[PDB]
Structure 1
Amino acid sequence: PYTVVYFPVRGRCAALRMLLADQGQSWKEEVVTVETWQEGSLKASCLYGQLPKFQDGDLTLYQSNTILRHLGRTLGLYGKDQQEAALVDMVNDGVEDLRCKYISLIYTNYEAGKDDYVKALPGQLKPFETLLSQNQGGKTFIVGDQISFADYNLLDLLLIHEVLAPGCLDAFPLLSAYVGRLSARPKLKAFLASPEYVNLPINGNGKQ
């Protein structure tokens, strides 16, 4: 255990938080405010001038996907073997691609871009439905028979997209059932219901 240093928002920490909670891990949240970030000191000290910053004992990490991979590796949430690990990466990189588009919409082009984005969304989600359809008929996880860090990241992606574009999973039965199934995992369900999650905004600019 484990310190997450981040703004008071869900953003790029939501998936790794869901992971730690569902895995019964303990961690410390160090919350960084607007004024503190503007002051410049903390920012200058971050490897790539960005949060999150993550501490695991004497190890300091940056990059949300690095933190996800590290937790995946250390907690056995990275597939059963190398072949599965590659598939886990393949899913997570696809989640990250759509997250980058989501982030660009939210922070740079929300008013003008939202219509085009929502129109494009079904074709962006379809690959994850297809992956589910090709793995145990979508009844288990995104890769293999055990949960991986990519499940937490995909789940987050789908949750924030349901806020953006209500009904966006209605055409996708496997993704729909997967969101319900994962969201019901007792520790995860508890975390999702908690004010620690519910009372943080998704993003830092009031848009969702």
Structure 2
Amino acid sequence: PPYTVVYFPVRGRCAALRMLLADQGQSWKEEVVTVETWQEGSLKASCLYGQLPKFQDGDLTLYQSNTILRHLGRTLGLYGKDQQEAALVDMVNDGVEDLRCKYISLIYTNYEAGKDDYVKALPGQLKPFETLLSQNQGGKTFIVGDQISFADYNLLDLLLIHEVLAPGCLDAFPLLSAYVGRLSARPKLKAFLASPEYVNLPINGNGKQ
């Protein structure tokens, strides 16, 4: 710390790290970038990959959303209890990232023509996470081990955005439905999910959801 997040005024790729910082009781500053200030290209040229989010932690600056999650994961102790759990946390996060990429492609390039097929294929894409919960203490704790990890906040966000795209998509998965319930109830996280800074931001940049 202290932290600063730089991004567009949407939830998008910053939703999971904001949930992690709020639930861990950390403070941070937000620097909002409008499409107007982004279209003038001078901030875009200073970004390593010409994209946002950008993040600061003291004198360290970082890019890439999953690198920011892994960094808070290791500096705050949200990365498993050992190397074996740290590898399982990475395997869940990479799976969450693959489906997040398919969701983003549906939202930004084919929403009207491909949402029915995307929703027809959704059960198959969520089954792996229900299976991972069934293997960890009967799905009664977290996605890996018995302590929360950064992959829990990234998987929670992906489940919450899919319920907005296909209401009831989790009805067929008992353990994922119960897991979204338990984590949404953690005190600091429940207060943050009800706040205007979270509820009043669109999920995506094109208004689709």
Measured against the shorter chain, the TM-score band is over 0.9
Separation in structure 2 between the aligned mates of residue 67 and residue 119 of structure 1, nearest angstrom: 32
Structure 2 segments unaligned to the other structure (5+ residues): none
Deviations 1:77-102 (A, max 9, x none): 00000000000000000000000000
Shift of 1:34: 1.0
- Residue deviations 1:90-142, cap 9 Å, x none? 00000000000000000111111111110010000000000000000000000
Gaps of 5+ in 1: none
Distance in 2 (CA, whole Å) between partners of 1:47 and 1:2 is 19
Q: Secondary structure at the match of 1:142?
A: coil
The 5-angstrom pairing of residues 45-60 of structure 1 reads 45-60=46-61
Residue by residue over 1:32-90, the C-alpha shift from the partner in whole angstroms, topping out at 9 and shown as x without a partner, is 00100111000111000100000000100000000000000000000000000000000
CA distance in 2, matches of 1:78, 1:188: 19
What does the per-residue CA deviation read over 1:150-201, in whole Å, with 9 as the maximum and x for residues that have no partner? 0000000000000000000000000000000000000000000000000000
* Partner SS, residue 41 of structure 1: coil
Distance between the aligned counterparts of 2:67 and 2:117, measured in 1?
31
Instruction: Report deviation, 1:149.
Output: 0.1
**Deviation >4 Å, runs of 4+:** none
Look up the match of 1:170: 171
Offset at 1:147?
0.1
Mapped pair 1:190 → 2:191: yes
Structure 2 length-normalised TM: 0.99
Distance 2:14 2:98 in 1: 16
Residue matched to 1:139: 140
Compare 111-120 and 144-153 and name the one that shifted more: 111-120
C-alpha distance in 1, partners of 2:159/2:189?
15
Query: What SS class does the counterpart of residue 204 from structure 2 fall into?
Result: coil
Query: Secondary structure, in 3 states, of the residue corresponding to 2:115?
Result: helix
Q: Distance in 1 between matches of 2:27 and 2:86?
A: 25
Where 2:207 maps in the other structure, the secondary structure is coil
SS of equivalent residue, structure 1 residue 40? coil
Distance 1:44 1:205 in 2: 23
State the distance in 1 between where 2:45 and 2:106 align. 27
Give the corresponding residue for 2:121: 120
Matched, 1:42 2:61: no
Match of 2:6 in 1: 5
Determine the C-alpha separation between the residues in 1 that align with 2:141 and 2:49.
Answer: 36
Tell me, yes or no, if structure 1 residue 109 matches structure 2 residue 110: yes
Q: Alignment partner of 2:143: what SS?
A: coil
Q: Give the TM-score normalised by structure 1.
A: 1.00
* Secondary structure of the structure 1 residue equivalent to 2:38: helix
Identity among equivalent positions (%) equals 100
CA RMSD after TM alignment: 0.4
